[PDB]
Enzyme design. Structure first.
Site, PDB file in Angstrom:
ATOM      1  CE1 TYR A   1       2.785 -17.715  17.575  1.00 39.73           C
ATOM      2  CE2 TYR A   1       0.578 -16.889  17.264  1.00 39.73           C
ATOM      3  CZ  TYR A   1       1.936 -16.670  17.285  1.00 39.73           C
ATOM      4  OH  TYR A   1       2.434 -15.422  17.035  1.00 39.73           O
TER       5      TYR A   1
ATOM      6  CG  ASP B   1      17.866 -15.096  13.192  1.00 40.33           C
ATOM      7  OD1 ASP B   1      17.890 -16.173  12.551  1.00 40.33           O
ATOM      8  OD2 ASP B   1      16.862 -14.345  13.269  1.00 40.33           O
TER       9      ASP B   1
ATOM     10  N   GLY C   1      11.979 -10.184   9.253  1.00 39.79           N
ATOM     11  CA  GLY C   1      10.606  -9.823   9.650  1.00 39.79           C
ATOM     12  C   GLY C   1      10.555  -8.691  10.660  1.00 39.79           C
ATOM     13  CB  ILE C   2       8.233  -8.100  13.545  1.00 36.47           C
ATOM     14  CG1 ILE C   2       6.954  -8.355  12.747  1.00 36.47           C
ATOM     15  CG2 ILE C   2       8.036  -7.049  14.623  1.00 36.47           C
ATOM     16  CD1 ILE C   2       5.888  -9.097  13.510  1.00 36.47           C
TER      17      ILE C   2
ATOM     18  CB  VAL D   1      15.457 -18.166  22.483  1.00 38.87           C
ATOM     19  CG1 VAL D   1      15.984 -16.909  21.823  1.00 38.87           C
ATOM     20  CG2 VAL D   1      14.342 -18.789  21.661  1.00 38.87           C
TER      21      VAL D   1
ATOM     22  CG  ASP E   1       2.618  -8.590   4.196  1.00 39.74           C
ATOM     23  OD1 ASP E   1       2.538  -9.850   4.064  1.00 39.74           O
ATOM     24  OD2 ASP E   1       2.838  -7.779   3.267  1.00 39.74           O
ATOM     25  N   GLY E   2       4.519 -10.301   5.947  1.00 41.10           N
ATOM     26  CA  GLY E   2       5.941 -10.663   5.811  1.00 41.10           C
ATOM     27  C   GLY E   2       6.049 -12.053   5.231  1.00 41.10           C
TER      28      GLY E   2
ATOM     29  CE  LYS F   1       3.720 -15.072  20.111  1.00 40.49           C
ATOM     30  NZ  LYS F   1       5.069 -14.541  20.432  1.00 40.49           N
TER      31      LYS F   1
ATOM     32  N   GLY G   1      -1.776  -7.809  15.548  1.00 39.13           N
ATOM     33  CA  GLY G   1      -2.904  -8.626  15.060  1.00 39.13           C
ATOM     34  C   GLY G   1      -2.401  -9.536  13.958  1.00 39.13           C
TER      35      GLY G   1
END
Lengths: 256, 256, 256, 256
Positions: C152, C36, C16-17, C60, C186-187, C156, C183
């Site tokens: 969530y 990861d 992803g990102i 993490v 996609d993914g 954030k 915002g």
């Protein structure tokens, strides 16, 4: 009760939210100047509310009119304890159709009107040495921009900023400056507002006003009565520590 | 008066702001569960306040305690109309000295405690079908970070968010969720707070507390009595249209 | 080019990102640790991105895993100049159905994972005496609450707060802490996200993802490649004066 | 060469931040209109910056001057791809000493000038069908009020509002409208700014300037070179997805 013996002036109070605030303030023991450019309707509204309310001719776009409205309050009520800057105009246009006339007209009433009325009320309150309450009328529009509402949004954002600035400058004089940010409020104005969105968003008449009302998290469009609680509170002793705030009273329309 | 016949529970209310809110709520006609981990002092506080105040043992970090506190309210008062999430813990440390213990303990009380008490009150309020009022206690710290207060700031930031989310989710049940953000309030706690700043900022004891009090635009450190008006208002009918808001009651310390 | 010779670690960057950020960083001449929990998807990601990428197993939520990842980074690359806190978990549920399991899982990864990974990178960056760049991944969710998304949104919100607090505390070490708020991006993750909204809003599968993309003022669902400009910018010398900010890159979804 | 072949106009760019932007844009391969009321300082700036810079006489308070400036840009460069609304005027005065002259002058330049230049640029960009980039200069002043700075704060608050509204309306034409909010930035303007604060706060000359520089978390007063990174970024393809944002580049002075 909560505003007993206080002298208030509400700009544009002949009808709608301002008149609801003036009736609420009279019920709580205030003497209230029903200040309006519509001196005929203001005179009507004062007669109907009772002896505590009195009509004052006022155009917040004119310094001489602002100064004569304040002086009129000193004449009738002995001075000024509570200002509500309620007078406002709406307009709507996409960026490429915004006119200098739209910009000038809305900034003159919504910003200059508020700023210079607040300044003249502050001068009177500083001269009395008894502190004071100033309540500016902001809007969800001043919290965030809208594609079609750049001018009114900007005016209401300037109001929030002025509320912050004047609040920090005037609190040394025991004057609380704060603002109310309504969401969408029902009334005669929505014919105009719905029309303006109808044109630019290409909608049947009344669709915009229907959708907006249904999207308020609370579940309906606002009434003036939703706002009178806050209006009394921010003019009352229970708000003495509250400074330079904008409080959204808007069924959850905007979260600040 | 304004909370006549209402049943309220205020978490951490044996002392300080929560006790001030319980005394104010009692004076406005409410029955108040003075909920605290310190059941001994809760018992003392309820006895002083009067017949309308009653002590409830509550550790907001434990589900079974939360659920027994809400049940205890149903038993004694016939139900729950008003929740004030007041229980909270402060800590201070630069980023490189933050401990998992500080994180775990502050998030457990300030976030989990507020969230799961709010959830338990909401569940009871929905089952009653009479709507409700929930008031979260945020802070200037939730409005913006500080170098030395990353954990407490983050917890109060999480509270503002939760207030927004819970408010949108619960308003269909006629439960208003809002929050009060105090600035700096005088009291016993400032021994700890000044001590913590004193160390990390290298200051004589009592300096931080003095500078902070003099920096409040209003002109002084807060009291619990600055906050009681807002506590009543946001529990009252005059706040029915107000949803998912955090209101700063802070002498101008932070402008929202 | 703009990150020539710089050592980066991106949490959760096998897909992803995070993975789009690692490719962009390598393109700009950074060495990048592909941290990861999935060490096999990481090794794949590092093999494909090229020799400047290298796989690091990292949880993490675990202090030992955090410190071991930083050490591995130091061992391989000579040290750490850029951290991106990209590892996050999404979940959704209304207030009365929020579980302690959801609360604990999302806070452990989204808040504790960011905070203690940031803390470990800071210690390393201070010891090196060469400054640093830390980029937190916020969200539109961190800017405002939503009825279904309390947990969530709250995580954030805490990331933005923590970004402010760390930015202020760490700038004296020439470490820039800032955050990016996408915002809707996609993914593969959107299959999961749409499924949750589908279930709890009772919609046909893919309707939410479609509506959400169409409501973006820019006019489409975002891509990871929309965000890589800002990810490079905030790790480059062109952002040296930028401190404690959250920058929305969201096609107008939220305005800050 | 991130702005290769792009046509920019920067209002008030003969000196200070605007001039820094013009030089940086030229370095990145842009042709730049150095627009200024002072045509002599414009010509000298353009002669110094090199062949890709050219002087345009422009009074952003006058619609005819605005339209004549856009025309000159199309004439010289073939079209307009990037507008920076940099022309602004500072003033300071407490609420009771604000003149109608100060209000009118600062709103005409800071708000009307920005809005109507943005409109003239938008119309040209729409006619061209190639999209474009508009960057408004906001300020820390626009993010929060100050006791002495109500008028300038209000204009910059209106710039942020207009940036949001314009961005939403113009993104359909592939025009990105965003803003930069500097904190405190050095230049020959700070003699004038410090003098006003010295005047109204009663300080030795240079104390304000020194105190404001030392309070920047980053640890110094800003330079125009701190801001050029973001001015290029927001005019480049790496910001295509960025819409209706105000980005603080202020060394941590204000956190948004």
């Amino acid at each position: 009760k909560r505003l007993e013996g206080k002298s208030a002036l509400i700009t544009g109070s002949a009808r709608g939210i301002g008149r609801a605030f003036a009736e609420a303030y009279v019920r709580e023991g205030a003497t209230v100047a029903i200040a309006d450019i519509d001196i005929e309707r203001a005179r009507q509204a004062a007669a109907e509310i009772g002896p505590a309310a009195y009509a004052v001719q006022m155009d917040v776009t004119r310094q001489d009119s602002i100064d004569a409205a304040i002086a009129a309050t000193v004449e009738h009520a002995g001075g000024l304890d509570i200002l509500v800057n309620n007078a406002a105009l709406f307009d709507l246009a996409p960026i490429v159709e915004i006119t200098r006339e739209s910009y000038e007209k809305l900034f003159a009433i919504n910003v200059a009107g508020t700023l210079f009325t607040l300044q003249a009320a502050a001068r009177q309150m500083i001269a009395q040495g008894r502190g004071g309450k100033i309540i500016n009328m902001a809007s969800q529009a001043g919290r965030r921009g809208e594609a079609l509402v750049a001018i009114y949004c900007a005016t209401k954002a300037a109001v929030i900023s002025l509320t912050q600035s004047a609040g920090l400058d005037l609190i040394k004089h025991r004057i609380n400056v704060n603002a109310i940010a309504p969401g969408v409020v029902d009334g005669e104005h929505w014919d105009g507002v719905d029309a303006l969105f109808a044109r630019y968003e290409n909608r049947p008449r009344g669709e915009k006003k229907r959708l907006v009302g249904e999207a308020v998290p609370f579940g309906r469009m606002g009434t003036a009565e939703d706002l009178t609680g806050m209006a009394i509170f921010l003019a009352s002793a229970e708000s003495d520590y509250i400074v330079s705030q904008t409080y959204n009273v808007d069924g959850g329309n905007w979260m600040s």
